[PDB]
Amino acid sequence: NRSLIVTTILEEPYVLFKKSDKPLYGNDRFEGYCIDLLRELSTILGFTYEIRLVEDGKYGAQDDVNGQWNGMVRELIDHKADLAVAPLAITYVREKVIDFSKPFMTLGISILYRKGTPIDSADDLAKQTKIEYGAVEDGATMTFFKKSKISTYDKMWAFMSSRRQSVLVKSNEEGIQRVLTSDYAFLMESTTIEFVTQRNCNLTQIGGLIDSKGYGVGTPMGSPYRDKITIAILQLQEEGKLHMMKEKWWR
Amino acid sequence: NRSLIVTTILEEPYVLFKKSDKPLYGNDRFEGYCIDLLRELSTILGFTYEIRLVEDGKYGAQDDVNGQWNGMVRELIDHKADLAVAPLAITYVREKVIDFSKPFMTLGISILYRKGTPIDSADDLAKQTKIEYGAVEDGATMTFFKKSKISTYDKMWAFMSSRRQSVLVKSNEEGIQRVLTSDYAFLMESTTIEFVTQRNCNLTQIGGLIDSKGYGVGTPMGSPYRDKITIAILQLQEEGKLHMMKEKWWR
Amino acid sequence: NRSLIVTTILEEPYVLFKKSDKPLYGNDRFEGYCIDLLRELSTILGFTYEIRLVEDGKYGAQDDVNGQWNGMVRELIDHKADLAVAPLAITYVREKVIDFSKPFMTLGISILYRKGTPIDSADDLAKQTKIEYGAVEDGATMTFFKKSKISTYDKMWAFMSSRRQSVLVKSNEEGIQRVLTSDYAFLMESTTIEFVTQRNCNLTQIGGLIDSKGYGVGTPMGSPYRDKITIAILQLQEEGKLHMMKEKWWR
Amino acid sequence: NRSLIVTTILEEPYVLFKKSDKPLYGNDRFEGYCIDLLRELSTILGFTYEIRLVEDGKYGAQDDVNGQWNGMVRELIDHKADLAVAPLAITYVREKVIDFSKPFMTLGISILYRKGTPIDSADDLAKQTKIEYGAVEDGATMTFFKKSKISTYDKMWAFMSSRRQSVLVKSNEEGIQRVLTSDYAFLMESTTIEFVTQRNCNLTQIGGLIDSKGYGVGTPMGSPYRDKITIAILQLQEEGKLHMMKEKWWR
Ligand SMILES: N[C@@H](Cn1oc(=O)[nH]c1=O)C(=O)O
Numbered sequence A, B, C, D: 001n002r003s004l005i006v007t008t009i010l011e012e013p014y015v016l017f018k019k020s021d022k023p024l025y026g027n028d029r030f031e032g033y034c035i036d037l038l039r040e041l042s043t044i045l046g047f048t049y050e051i052r053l054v055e056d057g058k059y060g061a062q063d064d065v066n067g068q069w070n071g072m073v074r075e076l077i078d079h080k081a082d083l084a085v086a087p088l089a090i091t092y093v094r095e096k097v098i099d100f101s102k103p104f105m106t107l108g109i110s111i112l113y114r115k116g117t118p119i120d121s122a123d124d125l126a127k128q129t130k131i132e133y134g135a136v137e138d139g140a141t142m143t144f145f146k147k148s149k150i151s152t153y154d155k156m157w158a159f160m161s162s163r164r165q166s167v168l169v170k171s172n173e174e175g176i177q178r179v180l181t182s183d184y185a186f187l188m189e190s191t192t193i194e195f196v197t198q199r200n201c202n203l204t205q206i207g208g209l210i211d212s213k214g215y216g217v218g219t220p221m222g223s224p225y226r227d228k229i230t231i232a233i234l235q236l237q238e239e240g241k242l243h244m245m246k247e248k249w250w251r
């Protein structure tokens, strides 16, 4: 039973490089909610593993031209990883190419912006073009807008799409820092927004949740690990361990 | 400028009887998030008021038979009150008969249940008939299920409707107590669930949000106060006062 | 401009007595698709009205002996009513004695029977004499069979005719209840069959439509209201209001 | 017992290419109402099969000049297939050259058009030449008009025939698209119209059914399979399976 290769992505407080005065090795080099989850999965299900950072640095989306997937989703498809343990949104389009365990966390797309402004909803952003807004490129949020038939969101996509290179960022961190330096609103997941606004009193969520989804462990389609992982996650859920992990990393 | 009549409903931590040794009079007899909001609205917009508890003790739903509304919605329709300041959900069906200010709080329907169980979503409740579940009668949540066309929710309503007297309670507090004394899951709004679980370690929210909505001040349709109230709420929102009020009452 | 007298007949979901905990008066005593249609006609064309239930309880047919008409058709002929707003089939024989507006609904004669049987068409009923079948007396369906030169239907009429008092019922409701209690097949209009099978999972339509016709508002021949009514109906049609009414009463 | 060759044609929701990330093989490459029917026929009657799409992409009509048939009808005549399982209309002219099982579905020709217009019947289309209209070439609907002796239909055919290249399309999907991009009305079967309008709120059926017919499995004339197939279809009908299949694909 060789070690499983687990792909993930850097995103506070789910996954981050662990800091230490002394050299760190193997699994100890990383820490976070998803890293704790991965550890619990490994002992409950009995497996060793190597943590690999998704090489192209993306979550996963289908290319508009050739329809090929990228990010963690593509690494699973190509069997370059056995599992993807990260804040990976369970979506319909992704379920068509990879499998997901049951959710270990629920969330929804929302807006991150500076406080003190009259912007109070997605509509308030969509009805104007002065304040720019975006999302991380090749992520579930972007895909949500790209596929939305809801007028407000569809026009928001038209906006983002027409200014793609300027408003779609390489990482959520890049979008957050931007909201802090320029007149920019950032579309990202509520769980993360909670973490960010907790540590930046100048930031706030705008409006409520635009949708409802969950984070799940991804596996190559047909993987025998998916159902086992679901059993482990549901067990961690019932015992209140997932709640304890959330409190630990969010506070 | 006679005092305005404000209808509301008892629901912690939005509205509650203020406790005291010395007799309390007038507006001071009540307290809560919505009572603070009402106070801020009165000084900002310049009006005095009388707080009245909705006579039939209901939020508001349209009767199947005669299609007549009840609760605070009906009190506004009949002009028995000038404003309704309470955790009143802004919904399409209500907007057809009364007006709402912009929301002062965003939330969504979710599930309240005991922790330690294998129930992890609305689907887990819907696919079984042992564990009963319900909502407050004549409220936005019940109406959501009654009108839902979504498979899971549609069958959950079939369930609730067929056991109406047993599972649709007269108040949210009744539903919460039912969750603590029997194998019962309660469908109610996330903002309130947050408050309840914060004070009852044995309770927990199940799954994420089933929908997205907001609480707004209700007024008779055509009321000149609605737009004024919206300006006051948006101002309280911008200055961070609504956030301060939420923190104060949810702690 | 005195109130118009409108004759109609009881038939779910077109016309029915409205139920209420409190006393109902005037037009409010009735409800249904045709009652909604009548209301829309009254406001669009500007007239008040009295709803009268056809006294002999019949739709309308010509007596085999003296050739006199009965039902709603006869009430129009005798000018006992200004309009007939009901699920009244527009037929050639009726057009000879009264006028019809353009159709507000299209349908066709079909078979209502229990499911799980080998009966799959009119032919399957006609080729046997064990299973009895009928239609409402003095209605368009009966008249269709009585005048049909199509072998299968002509022999079906011979059958019904020879057992008239046993198989021809007083109302469609009587024929439906019978299909539910005995080995009986009922010939009636597809629109109504749709409503019935929707509420009785034990019932089903057998085969397709035996013919094609429509329901129209009837008026005494030469009535100045007929063309106006047609304008109103065509307007309700174009705006999708007739479709909305159908969905409302059929679901 | 070699596998039977089954000819069919692409037409939602009867027959369509099944979508998937993983490669699909054999029978699994297709799906739809008729594909489910075909599967049930194979297990009930005991045969394996190969699905082939009719080479010339046509349903079947007899050529004016050489009086030769084309489409699935011709493939059956020439014994290029053992069965034709598709939304194949049972018609008198086809019964002269191939055999049909009893129908598995009943329908009728009707009109597909945009809503909000004053067109309310075939007569409204026939009495004008501005709005063009047509049908799929080499199909039962076109043949119905081509052979009709009914005034309205006869002139509608004169119209279509004189503009054949412009108004007679190569597929029903082409006709539907034409309805959404130009002042065009499309003559097609009611079962399919139901499916189309259910998914395109801008479309609607115009008038009622112009005729009555059914879909049956086609076989070469004299095929020993035809009676066996009829027994299987009638059994599926009785048990309610055909109704279940219709609900599944029409939703
Ligand atoms: N978890 C997201 C990545 N991304 O992070 C957000 O907060 N929004 C977003 O699109 C994904 O799995 O695609």
Ligand SMILES: N[C@@H](Cn1oc(=O)[nH]c1=O)C(=O)O
Binding pocket: B059, B060, B087, B088, B089, B135, B136, B138, B139, B140, B141, B142, B172, B187, B188, B189, B190, B192
């Ligand atoms: N806020 C609700 C009342 N009720 O409280 C809940 O939490 N659900 C629910 O239906 C309303 O305005 O109708």
Ligand SMILES: N[C@@H](Cn1oc(=O)[nH]c1=O)C(=O)O
Binding pocket: C059, C060, C087, C088, C089, C135, C136, C138, C139, C140, C141, C142, C172, C187, C188, C189, C190, C192
């Ligand atoms: N609508 C019919 C009465 N009746 O109802 C049916 O369904 N068939 C029938 O003859 C009429 O106007 O005569």
Ligand SMILES: N[C@@H](Cn1oc(=O)[nH]c1=O)C(=O)O
Binding pocket: D059, D060, D087, D088, D089, D135, D136, D138, D139, D140, D141, D142, D172, D187, D188, D189, D190, D192
């Ligand atoms: N099912 C038809 C083909 N076609 O599809 C329609 O809807 N009309 C029409 O002619 C046939 O078997 O010829």
Ligand SMILES: [Cl-]
Binding pocket: A026, A027, A028, A049, A050, A051, A052
């Ligand atoms: Cl590692």
Ligand SMILES: [Cl-]
Binding pocket: B026, B027, B028, B049, B050, B051, B052
């Ligand atoms: Cl008071």
Ligand SMILES: [Cl-]
Binding pocket: C026, C027, C028, C049, C050, C051, C052
């Ligand atoms: Cl009346």
Ligand SMILES: [Cl-]
Binding pocket: D026, D027, D028, D049, D050, D051, D052
């Ligand atoms: Cl195949």
